[PDB]
């Protein structure tokens, strides 16, 4: 009783995703009239976001697209789109529509649970089947950043709806903490990483936290954010900083601590994690964010979480000494706007690459 998926994909891919600000997410209420609004918004917005990214999947190299794991993920997206299409003609006034819709979103979230490692298997299949080539590799890199960020955004919309309209922290709005204590999240991530480091190495570096609240030097630093995302980024950074520290100090009983600075400025809330884990040459930094060399998507995915609300995650090392990692976040909820890839000529053109000698000299 539904049209073929391609008809829906073509229709919805014409629209641009509509980025929401942290402030907008937060300003969304929990009434039945709010739920109807969420419903009528999401039955348009989720298909738009699904369609847009599905169109880009089709731009992947034939070699990548032909892999069974990429084809599997595609099929999940198709079914999720179709699931939502069942609601196009349903009455928001009917409470059964709303409850069924929430169930359908839960089913979609579960279906897509293993998307990240499934796509990674697809990349591995491409490499095993054909051997990798630099043109395909660049396309894969460009695509995966956009695909994973798109996924993050879709999961955000679904979690917001299901959490609000169906409780550890009643003060949270869905997955959003309007008063996230940044240092508390830092400590939580450190604690968990320490458990892992202690398990394997029977030791771990201590943590030192310093806050710089530029405008209000006394006040503990808080922000509007999704703590699970911040936790995710910090846990990944701690794991790397701890491993570097212990491994570069095999002969020592005294380990240099990991130092974190949390700075609050007018526009940025920045979190720097500094280790003395011996560092890595500049040449090897890019590779840390590479899906190909990582085929462990911890770092590239953490950076996408940072970028999702207009932030970033940057690494700077000093080979022979150690490494600084910085999470840049927007200080203000009004500046924290979803960063969403969109399917258009620009995106399309970016895939249109091919083999040739670069614009810089080789000896």
Ligand X SMILES: O=S(=O)(c1ccc(O)cc1O)N1Cc2ccc(O)cc2C1
Binding-site members for ATP are 236-243, 275, 294-299
Q: Which is nearer to ligand X, 56 or 275 (CB)?
A: 275
127 is known as an active-site residue: no
240 is known as an active-site residue: yes
CA distance 224 to 23: 8
CA distance 176 to 86: 29
Least Cβ distance, residue 79 to a copy of itself (angstroms): 25
CA distance 277 to 282: 15
- Residue choice 38, 139, 240, 274 for contact with ligand X (CB under 6 A): 240
Both structure tokens of 43: 């039955």
Binding-site positions read 236-243, 275, 294-299
Interior angle at CA 318, CA 315 and CA 324, nearest 5: 35
Interacting residues with a copy of itself between 200 and 229 (CB under 8 A): 212-215
- Residue choice 9, 26, 237, 306 for contact with ligand X (CB under 6 A): 237
Both structure tokens of 191: 């604690």
Least Cβ distance, residue 146 to a copy of itself (angstroms): 8
Using an 8 Å Cβ cutoff, are 331 and 265 in contact? yes
Which of a copy of itself, ligand X, none sits in contact with 243, Cβ below 5 to 8 A by type? ligand X
Within 10 A of 332 (CB to CB), how many other CB atoms are there?
Answer: 16
The verdict on 270 binding ligand X (CB under 6 A) reads: no
Which of a copy of itself, ligand X, none sits in contact with 275, Cβ below 5 to 8 A by type? ligand X
Residue 209: HSE in the Cβ half-sphere, 13 Å Cα cutoff: 20
Within 10 A of 346 (CB to CB), how many other CB atoms are there?
Answer: 8
Q: Alpha helices of 172-260 — where are they, by DSSP H?
A: 182-201, 227-247
Q: Which is nearer to ligand X, 157 or 301 (CB)?
A: 301
- Residue choice 8, 9, 13, 17 for contact with a copy of itself (CB under 8 A): 17
Which of ligand X, a copy of itself, none sits in contact with 261, Cβ below 5 to 8 A by type? a copy of itself
Instruction: Find the part of the chain contacting ligand X (CB under 6 A) among 26-34, 43-51, 239-247, 348-356.
Output: 239-247
**Tell me, what DSSP letter sits at residue 336?**
-
The three-state secondary structure class of 153 is helix
137 is known as an active-site residue: no
Give every CB contact of residue 342 below 8 A, 6+ residues apart in sequence.
16, 17, 52
Catalytic residue, chosen from 35, 56, 236, 338, is 236
The verdict on 26 binding ligand X (CB under 6 A) reads: no
86 is known as an active-site residue: no
The verdict on 293 binding a copy of itself (CB under 8 A) reads: no
- Residue choice 265, 287, 293, 296 for contact with a copy of itself (CB under 8 A): 265
Axis crossing angle, helix 115-130 with helix 134-164, rounded to the nearest 10: 170
The three-state secondary structure class of 254 is coil
Instruction: Find the part of the chain contacting a copy of itself (CB under 8 A) among 119-127, 231-239, 252-260, 318-326.
Output: 318-326
Using an 8 Å Cβ cutoff, are 271 and 262 in contact? yes
The three-state secondary structure class of 322 is strand
Instruction: Find the part of the chain contacting a copy of itself (CB under 8 A) among 188-196, 222-230, 265-273, 294-302.
Output: 265-273
Using an 8 Å Cβ cutoff, are 324 and 274 in contact? yes
Catalytic site positions: 232, 236, 239-240
User: Footprint of ligand X on this chain (CB under 6 A)?
Assistant: 237, 240-241, 243-244, 247-248, 275, 277-280, 288, 315, 317, 323, 325
User: Footprint of a copy of itself on this chain (CB under 8 A)?
Assistant: 16-19, 21, 146, 212-215, 261, 263-268, 270, 272, 278-279, 281-283, 311-312, 314, 316-321, 324, 326, 328, 337-342, 344-347, 350, 356-363
């Amino acid at each position: 009783s539904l049209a073929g998926a391609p008809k829906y994909i073509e229709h919805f891919s014409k629209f641009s995703p509509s980025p929401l600000s942290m402030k907008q997410f937060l300003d969304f209420g929990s009434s039945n009239a709010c739920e109807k609004t969420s419903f009528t918004f999401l039955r348009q917005e989720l298909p738009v976001r699904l369609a847009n990214i599905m169109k880009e999947i089709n731009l992947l190299p034939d070699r990548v697209l032909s892999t069974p794991s990429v084809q599997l993920v595609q099929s999940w997206y198709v079914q999720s789109l179709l699931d939502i299409m069942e609601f196009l003609d349903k009455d928001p006034e009917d409470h059964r529509t709303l409850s069924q819709f929430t169930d359908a979103l839960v089913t979609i979230r579960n279906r897509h649970n293993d998307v990240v490692p499934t796509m990674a298997q697809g990349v591995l299949e491409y490499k095993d089947t054909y051997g990798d080539d630099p043109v395909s590799n660049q396309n894969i890199q460009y695509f995966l950043d956009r695909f994973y960020l798109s996924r993050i955004s879709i999961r955000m919309l679904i979690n917001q709806h299901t959490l609000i309209f169906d409780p550890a922290h009643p003060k949270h709005i869905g997955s959003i903490d309007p008063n996230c204590n940044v240092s508390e999240v830092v400590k939580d991530a450190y604690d968990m990483a320490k458990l892992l480091c202690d398990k394997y190495y029977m030791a771990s570096p201590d943590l030192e936290i310093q806050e710089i609240n530029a405008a209000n030097s006394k006040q503990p630093i808080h922000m509007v954010y999704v703590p699970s995302h911040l936790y995710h980024m910090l846990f990944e950074l701690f794991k790397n900083a701890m491993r570097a520290t212990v491994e570069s100090h095999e002969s020592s009983l005294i380990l240099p601590p990991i130092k974190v600075m949390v700075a609050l400025g007018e526009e940025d809330l920045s979190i720097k994690m500094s280790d003395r884990g011996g560092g890595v040459p500049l040449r090897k930094i890019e590779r840390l964010f590479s899906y190909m060399y990582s085929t462990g998507y911890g770092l590239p995915i953490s950076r996408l979480y940072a970028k999702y609300f207009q932030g970033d995650l940057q690494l700077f090392s000093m080979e022979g000494f150690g490494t600084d990692a910085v999470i840049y976040l927007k200080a203000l909820s009004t500046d924290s706007v979803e960063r969403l890839p969109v399917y258009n000529k620009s995106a399309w053109r970016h895939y249109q690459t091919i083999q040739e000698a670069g614009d810089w000299c080789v000896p």
